[PDB]
Design a protein around this ligand. Structure first.
Ligand SMILES: [Ba+2]
Ligand SMILES: [Ba+2]
Ligand SMILES: [Ba+2]
Ligand SMILES: [Ba+2]
Ligand SMILES: [Ba+2]
Ligand SMILES: [Ba+2]
Ligand SMILES: [Ba+2]
Ligand SMILES: [Ba+2]
Ligand SMILES: [Ba+2]
Ligand SMILES: [Ba+2]
Ligand SMILES: [Ba+2]
Ligand SMILES: [Ba+2]
Ligand SMILES: [Ba+2]
Ligand SMILES: [Ba+2]
Ligand SMILES: [Ca+2]
Ligand SMILES: [Ca+2]
Ligand SMILES: [Ca+2]
Ligand SMILES: [Ca+2]
Lengths: 616, 616
């Protein structure tokens, strides 16, 4: 009946899942709940197509492919590129044809998102056939399509814009600070030592003061001036003090507040949609369209929410006397708004979510705490076994087999545990809790490890087995029982998945800034390449290939000696208008995104503290 | 009368100033309000006695004093040390004898603070006479005496302890993280490349992973492992990601919350004392000790608070009808608690604080906005004049006199402004607003500059004049009229004095960590000193002298290539138990104090936003 349809709607809205219509929509979404899973791997592989792709560097140039400090394995032949791109674009084409099913023809192409999706698809197609028969913006539309493909990154982008609004203003003020400070600094050391300051007039001093602002060149950049006079330092310290602890911090504060504001905006935009779900449910169960529901119409919805969703109580005549007790007046009173708060309160404060003989013997013992204690002690002896095997491999006193085979059969004990636990709990019930999913993937990489190690053909054993000691990382959850380190560990655990859309966003930003590196900074040998610098002759073993560009972009992201990539390339291309790359990168990923994730970590920790204080 | 005494008490308690008694106390505190000013300069000079003092390095050793990359001017002869220390200790002795006057004999020596003060004094004495007739902990008791000398740093220390409590716990968890990560990393690269990892077994890997945790060696420390295999990076990035953005951030969060808590505790401890002041006032004006005050006893206190403190209204029979209106019932009703809220509300929402012919002509025109506009335009043309003089000095096309003499007479216009403004407003009224004090000190360094430049005897002109263009920094206050950059600038302005006790605290911490450097790391030439490192042969132009040790401590504080001081000294002394210095420093001044000031900047900015939102 319509009532049951409601129960599904209320339970789904409670689970925060929802559609966007108003039985085609139903059955089509049901067809989507499986296709989305393959679509995820599709998007991830299509994204990984970009780093595995060939480059524009070996393209009509000599003499590829050798090792002029450029490249790491592997690459892609143009044919494999063709077929792979064709496959991914085909499944993607299906993934773009599919949402038109549970939508109107004039409705689908009307949304700002879908038309952009299709546009990126036809761009990727008009580029895949051309790239086949024959390449610039081709990798860009891949990461672009990917970012908007997943809503949990789309919302993040909306957020980021919503704060970049004022972030531009605080950036302008920062720019003013830089300009003035650089001017005063330049006019301070004009007709004295040294040459590194005066070398390229004012612009050089602005450049170097900007690099001093990130403190990635602090001891050195004013070292000659300090050698001249010691009191010179009194300037620079004052510049750092006022620069890093005063300015940068309140920049972080600006990004903080802006983020919090836009986030409150986002969840405010979420509650409205959820309310739309609940009001849809009530609107459907209210056949008379009076705006209210009666007990003879309410206890059935309650009963359905009991039988199909959560567990409250039992409905009898006692229930009738209960409804007759709340007012000693009748009948009956529940409206469109009280119903929502009732559903929310029930879903919140109350509970949530073959022969029955041979299986029920284990289905009652696996739910017992004895099983958890079993796998606990198992991962303990697993720990001591692993640390022994490893501590004997480092002493080369092996005697490696009797322990590593034991860790293999430990992996077998883990796949046994995983199998019986995924069997006794459920197909989707075991998949709901994320920890069990982590254990699921760890196990399912352990077994493909077993296929790769035992079936077809040592050191590979040590490698592909010791890495999966992260299965024993769940033993650290024990520390939450201590009121000293509870909030910390809990915050971390809740941070692992919640910080993921931001990390993924900035990762995609890196994947966007890498294509720029391949397209512009292809050429790395030469006279310039060997001239400067010292460790830069070692540090520049990258940014020529794509994974190299990615990991050196990481090296920029940690701000560890980052400027050595900025300057060594500056005099590698010749033009100063190359550094505009680096700066931009910084000002996009250091003063914005990293401050954002700092803000989010802080806010998450405070939320955890407020939760622990709430339950007190 | 007693009532007037109250008015002074309520006004002082409102101004947050207070004593600690219960007319000796009165007159003695009045004698203190002037002595404290000299005591400040006394404490500052006594503190500056430490960096100007001699060292333990030239003490019975050869061959001082040359330039073996050790030392900057100036120093102190032992005789000058004797007389200076004697003077400072004498005035300090007076400053310790003085508080015993307005206190009880059995009361003074009973307080935990005073006895420690006197103890430090007699230590400084039993050390000054010995150091005279002849030196280890002598500089320590100076900074120690100084920190507790000023309450505004004492409270900061209390705060710091109150948070270091749990900060120890989060530090322990961090230690665990380091240990485990270092172990797994070490066992990852055991029987492969390279040597930098295995060199000193596990401890070396813990050391290097710890230096990777501060990201001050990120590209390099795993560079050989990356040269071996590219996939090795996949480890380290995961270590940095999980290390810097997950751990360090919630460490900052811990310090944040702890700080906020202890601060709320502190201001809570402040309001209690203020309430004690107000309750003292009411308790004194309530002669009958009934706990309440009548209108015929209240309008006189009101009248006194009008005539001597702030400005409300006028008291007539209309006032009597007003009191007869609030209830149409009498008489009369004000108790000990309502009086406090009344005083607070009046002091908050309402206002706050020779022939009268020749002077009153200027005393009415200086208060006009035309004067502010005058000095504004004056500092504008001052700006263009200064930028012209400076931009012609850098072109060596001078023609320097006609502009620099104009900036001198500009300084004269500023001392004229300062004189007439300090004359027309008041002796202490001009001193209340901090901005006018900044202008006062700028002016009063400009005039001693005039004494040093014009009276006794160029480039010295340029130097000692261009530096005081910070008098034109008040032109940046104009930006607050823009609703884009208002909160930022305002926050900064309010941060300049409020962040000062923390900066002073960490500065004193540096001054404590410097004596350790002089006493332990005296010896810097040698074989070790020239061996490592490259830029470290240039970077180690310090930490031998005291100001050198201070500025290189600054170089450590900014975490710019800090580890090069840590390692170069490690193999300069030989023992690893020297690095325990550096680490400690870090873990005291980077994970605690700097996170504290970050938290404080953020909190200040948020407070500013809440204020601007409040007035909306
Ligand atoms: Ba010059
Ligand atoms: Ba000059
Ligand atoms: Ba250089
Ligand atoms: Ba930082
Ligand atoms: Ba109605
Ligand atoms: Ba459970
Ligand atoms: Ba619990
Ligand atoms: Ba170097
Ligand atoms: Ba080995
Ligand atoms: Ba091995
Ligand atoms: Ba090395
Ligand atoms: Ba009473
Ligand atoms: Ba005023
Ligand atoms: Ba105003
Ligand atoms: Ca292709
Ligand atoms: Ca109805
Ligand atoms: Ca002395
Ligand atoms: Ca009374």
């Amino acid at each position: 009946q319509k009532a049951a349809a409601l129960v599904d709607l209320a339970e789904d809205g409670i689970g925060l899942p929802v559609e966007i219509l108003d039985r085609y929509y139903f059955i089509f979404t049901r067809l989507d709940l499986i296709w989305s899973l393959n679509y995820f791997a599709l998007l991830f592989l299509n994204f990984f197509e970009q780093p595995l792709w060939c480059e524009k560097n070996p393209k009509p140039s000599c003499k590829d492919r050798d090792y002029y400090y450029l490249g790491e394995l592997p690459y892609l032949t143009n044919a494999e590129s063709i077929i792979y791109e064709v496959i991914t674009l085909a499944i993607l084409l299906v993934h773009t044809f599919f949402p038109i099913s549970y939508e109107g023809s004039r409705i689908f192409w009307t949304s700002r998102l879908n038309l952009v999706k299709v546009a990126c698809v036809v761009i990727l197609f008009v580029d895949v056939l051309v790239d086949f028969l024959y390449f610039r913006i081709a990798p860009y539309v891949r990461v672009i399509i990917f970012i908007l493909s997943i809503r949990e990154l789309r919302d993040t982008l909306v957020l980021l814009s919503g704060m970049l609004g004022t972030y531009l203003n605080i950036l302008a003020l920062w720019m003013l600070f830089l300009l003035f400070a650089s001017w005063i600094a330049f006019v301070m050391f004009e007709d004295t030592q040294q040459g590194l300051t005066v070398f390229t007039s004012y612009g050089a001093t602005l450049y170097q003061m900007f690099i001093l602002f990130t403190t990635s060149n602090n001891p050195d950049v004013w070292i000659p001036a300090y050698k001249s006079s010691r009191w010179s330092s009194v300037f620079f310290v004052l510049y750092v003090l006022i620069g890093v602890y005063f300015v940068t911090n309140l920049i972080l504060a600006v990004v903080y507040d802006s983020f919090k504001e836009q986030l409150a905006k986002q969840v405010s935009g979420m509650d409205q949609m959820k309310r739309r779900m609940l009001e849809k449910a009530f609107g459907l169960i209210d056949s008379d369209k009076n705006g209210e529901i009666d007990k003879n119409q309410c206890i059935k919805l309650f009963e359905q929410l009991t039988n199909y969703r959560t567990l409250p109580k039992i409905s009898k005549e006692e229930f009738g006397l209960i409804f007759d007790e709340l007012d000693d007046t009748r009948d009956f009173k529940i409206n469109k708004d009280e119903f929502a708060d009732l559903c929310q309160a029930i879903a919140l404060r109350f509970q949530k979510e073959y022969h029955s003989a041979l299986s029920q013997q284990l289905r009652a013992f696996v739910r017992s705490p004895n099983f958890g204690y079993a796998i606990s002690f198992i991962l303990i002896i697993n720990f001591i076994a692993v640390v022994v095997e490893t501590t004997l491999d480092i002493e080369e006193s092996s005697a490696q087999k009797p322990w590593q085979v034991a860790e293999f059969v430990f992996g077998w004990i883990y796949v046994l545990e995983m199998a019986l636990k995924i069997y006794t709990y459920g197909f989707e019930n075991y998949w709901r809790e994320g920890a069990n999913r982590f254990d699921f993937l760890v196990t399912w990489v352990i077994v493909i490890g077993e296929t790769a190690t035992f079936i077809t053909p040592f050191s590979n054993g040590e490698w592909i087995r010791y890495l999966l000691l992260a299965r024993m990382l769940r033993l650290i959850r024990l520390l939450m029982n201590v009121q000293r380190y509870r909030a910390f560990i809990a915050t971390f655990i809740t941070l692992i998945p919640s910080l993921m859309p931001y990390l993924g966003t900035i990762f995609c930003v890196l994947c966007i800034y890498c294509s720029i590196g391949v397209q512009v900074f292809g050429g790395l040998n030469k006279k310039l390449f060997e001239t400067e610098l010292a460790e830069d002759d070692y540090l520049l073993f990258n940014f020529n290939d794509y994974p190299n560009g990615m990991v050196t972009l990481f090296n920029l992201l940690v701000m560890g000696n980052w400027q050595v990539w900025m300057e060594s390339y500056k005099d590698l291309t010749g033009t100063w208008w190359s550094i505009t790359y680096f700066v931009s990168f910084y000002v996009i990923t250091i003063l914005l995104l990293l401050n954002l994730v700092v803000a989010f970590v802080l806010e998450a920790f405070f939320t955890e503290l407020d939760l622990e204080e709430e339950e007190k």
